[PDB]
Amino acid sequence: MSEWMKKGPLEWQDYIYKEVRVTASEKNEYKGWVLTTDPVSANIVLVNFLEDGSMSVTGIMGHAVQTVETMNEGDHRVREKLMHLF
Amino acid sequence: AQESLESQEQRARAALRERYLRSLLAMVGHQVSFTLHEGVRVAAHFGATDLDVANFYVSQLQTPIGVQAEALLRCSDIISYTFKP
Numbered sequence: 001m002s003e004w005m006k007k008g009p010l011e012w013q014d015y016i017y018k019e020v021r022v023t024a025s026e027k028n029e030y031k032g033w034v035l036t037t038d039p040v041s042a043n044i045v046l047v048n049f050l051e052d053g054s055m056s057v058t059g060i061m062g063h064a065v066q067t068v069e070t071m072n073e074g075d076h077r078v079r080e081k082l083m084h085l086f
Numbered sequence: 087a088q089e090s091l092e093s094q095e096q097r098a099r100a101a102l103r104e105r106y107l108r109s110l111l112a113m114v115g116h117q118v119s120f121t122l123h124e125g126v127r128v129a130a131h132f133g134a135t136d137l138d139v140a141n142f143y144v145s146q147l148q149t150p151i152g153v154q155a156e157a158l159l160r161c162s163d164i165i166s167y168t169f170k171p
Contacts, residue, residue: 009098010091025165028121036105041139041161045109057109058168061161086108 004065005042012037017079019072020046025064031071032058033082044068047082110135117146118169120159130157132169142167 015034022030022044032046035057042062049055113132120128120142130144133156140161147154 009095009102012102013098026123026125028165030166035109036102038106038139039099039102040106040137043106043139045106054170056168056170057113058166059109060166061164063162064165086112 002063002065004044004068005062007042009039012039012042015044015068015070017074017082018070019074020044021069021071022046022060023066023068024060025066028060028064030058030060033074033078035082035085038062047085049081112171113169116169116171118144118167120164121166121168122163123165130159135161 016036017033019033030046032048035045035047037044044060044065046058116132117129118132122128128148130147133143133145135142142159142161144159145156147157
């Protein structure tokens, strides 16, 4: 099994509200803020605040995840925006 | 006193899962763009998944011959999905 799918829930939990770069199958790359990771499928959910002022939500399938790298720890402001979501 | 890591893990599992289900429920009725294996992209309205997250139930699946009313997409064929709340 893949590195990402073997991570403990307590490790997945520490990514929440951090900005991350994810490499996935077939050279697909993503960058965004972690909302959660599904402990059943290991799907990672990212939030993006895009250049046009709109907001997207992206799930990357756990079986397709290759690497996950933290880029930014966040701050109080972004954390509150993300907490208010859903 | 130090709480068992098994208990801590299972509680974190519940919190992660609850957030994930919330994210899927917020996606209901929106157009989502699926990045598929084999370099392909397809768009559809999201309806549901099963609890094992093995299948997505969708409606209004776009195809070259026209929009299909309903379909089931296997999560093993999917790399990513995106939408805009």
